[PDB]
Amino acid sequence: ECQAYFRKVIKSTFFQIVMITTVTTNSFLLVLGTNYDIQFEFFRTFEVSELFFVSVYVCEFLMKVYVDPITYWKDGYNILDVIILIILTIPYLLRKIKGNHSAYLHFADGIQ
Amino acid sequence: GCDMTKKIVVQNKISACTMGILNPVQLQKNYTYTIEKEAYDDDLIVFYEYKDLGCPRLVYYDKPWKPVVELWKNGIVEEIMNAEYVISEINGLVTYSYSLTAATANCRSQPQNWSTFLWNRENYVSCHEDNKDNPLLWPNVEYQVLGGQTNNKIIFGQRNGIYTFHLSVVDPYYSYCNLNTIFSVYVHGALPVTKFQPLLTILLMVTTTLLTAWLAYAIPKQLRS
Amino acid sequence: DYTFNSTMEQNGCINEAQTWDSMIEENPDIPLDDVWGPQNYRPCFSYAIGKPGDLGQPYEILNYSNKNHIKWPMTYAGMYVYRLKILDPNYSFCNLT
Ligand SMILES: *[C@@H]1O[C@H](CO)[C@@H](O[C@@H]2O[C@H](CO)[C@@H](O[C@@H]3O[C@H](CO)[C@@H](O)[C@H](O)[C@@H]3O)[C@H](O)[C@H]2NC(C)=O)[C@H](O)[C@H]1NC(C)=O
Ligand SMILES: *[C@@H]1O[C@H](CO)[C@@H](O[C@@H]2O[C@H](CO)[C@@H](O)[C@H](O)[C@H]2NC(C)=O)[C@H](O)[C@H]1NC(C)=O
Ligand SMILES: *[C@@H]1O[C@H](CO)[C@@H](O)[C@H](O)[C@H]1NC(C)=O
């Protein structure tokens, strides 16, 4: 039905520009977070930006949770990006709100 | 009796100063730090003194750490201290947990904690003897005694502040001297959490509902064309 | 225009000491003779007396068991008539210059 319009929207360059902007701001967040002052202080901007980034990544996974896995299960870059999404979503899901047993932190800069 | 020439010292082989956190040249003129209402119940406030203490030890959050104490006679290092000792807070904060809770430490005589009232070599009777009339009301009550033959430490909190550990040597067979000292540590954590009741999954489902609403709004965009 | 072997550090002085310039500013109008002496000596190895100042300034409490030598600027030639005085508060009863 509306799958043609959805594919036209995802082929539009504005969504790509927006998502590129969000992940470049994530790159700048990592650049500022490799420091110590912005790591835990003056970090309300860090919190709201990270919430925006995980919202954008959830939206991207919702776009890739379509019937397109029939091609995202045999291709090249496609399987790589969906696996990247999975091994992004799961670790910060069990890390940012952990409440569990774990050794220490070694996958924050790795996730970024 | 006691030997008056003995004293206990806590090592400070690397201090928090002389790098990009704090400098020694500034603390002595009333460099006063904050307590975020976590000791007893309000606007508590602590005054570090450089002349009394100096540059405090630096520690990190969620790191199993113990202080290593040396015994001094006539101002001379002779032997690191090995007996059982306890720590306390003069300000009265609880924002730090302990290691293995005396169960894997093979305690058997219901070890007393920091609730019986000041601990010293007189009031203390250990829990590794075979006292017969108080074995356990204790699945996992912690072990507020460090050093000795056990291997339990302090896990630190995320307060990101200065701590003034009041340390007392506790074993009544090391000496008649009430060995006591006060030293200063400072924790450097990673990240405070202000997420509250909105979870990651909660924000996820909020975003899914909003995206489905956007899809239901964009369906008439195709319908009208 | 004069310096010495070493600095405030590399000599074991944990805390801040007192130098010639510091004592000259300390004493406003009295001549240089009464500025410093054993009647006003306080050690650098204190942790309790004077100051946790910055470390790295030139150090002139030179003595034996230290290698501390004198130094002059390399370029111009000149003479600097120096009088040496012992600073120890409890060595001898008199003045020795
Ligand atoms: C400090 O040590 C004392 C022992 O001298 C501890 O008191 C004992 O604590 C245990 C576990 O907390 C109690 O066992 C259980 O208590 C709960 C109620 O909290 C009850 O529902 C269970 O059925 C079981 O009885 C034990 O009764 C209690 N004994 C006494 C005499 O109070 C104390 O908890 C320790 N506190 C700290 C902070 O380590
Ligand atoms: C100050 O300069 C003197 C140069 O006169 C240096 O003296 C040397 O010190 C070493 C270390 O004990 C001796 O082995 C040499 O024999 C000394 N040489 C001379 C010519 O005296 C001294 O190292 C300098 N001090 C500092 C802190 O750099
Ligand atoms: C800090 O305390 C010292 C002595 O306790 C006092 O001389 C000084 O004025 C105080 N400074 C401030 C800012 O409170």
Side-chain angles (χ1 to χ4, degrees), chain B residues 1-7 121 175-179:
Chain B
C2 174
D3 197 347
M4 317 307 304
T5 190
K6 276 192 229 147
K7 86 194 66 72
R121 77 178 299 277
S175 153
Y176 310 94
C177 297
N178 288 318
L179 293 147

Side-chain angles (χ1 to χ4, degrees), chain B residues 24-65:
Chain B
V25 307
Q26 52 203 180
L27 319 176
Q28 82 155 12
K29 191 33 83 204
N30 213 305
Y31 262 42
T32 279
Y33 301 138
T34 89
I35 314 295
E36 47 158 342
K37 201 186 105 47
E38 284 249 61
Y40 201 22
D41 197 273
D42 208 340
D43 283 337
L44 262 180
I45 168 180
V46 68
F47 332 103
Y48 194 98
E49 302 113 5
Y50 152 79
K51 284 277 173 88
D52 180 327
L53 324 159
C55 276
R57 277 140 279 269
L58 165 81
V59 289
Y60 302 96
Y61 161 87
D62 261 8
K63 298 221 53 149
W65 173 293

Side-chain angles (χ1 to χ4, degrees), chain C residues 4-7 9-11 66-71:
Chain C
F4 284 93
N5 214 174
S6 166
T7 70
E9 278 270 10
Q10 309 120 285
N11 251 326
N66 204 339
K67 310 309 176 159
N68 211 315
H69 282 53
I70 65 178
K71 283 224 281 218

Side-chain angles (χ1 to χ4, degrees), chain B residues 3 15 38 73 83 124 140 145 154-156 163 169 178 221:
Chain B
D3 197 347
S15 74
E38 284 249 61
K73 81 213 318 311
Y124 172 80
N140 247 341
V145 154
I154 282 66
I155 307 303
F156 269 116
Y163 295 160
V169 178
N178 288 318
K221 254 195 155 189

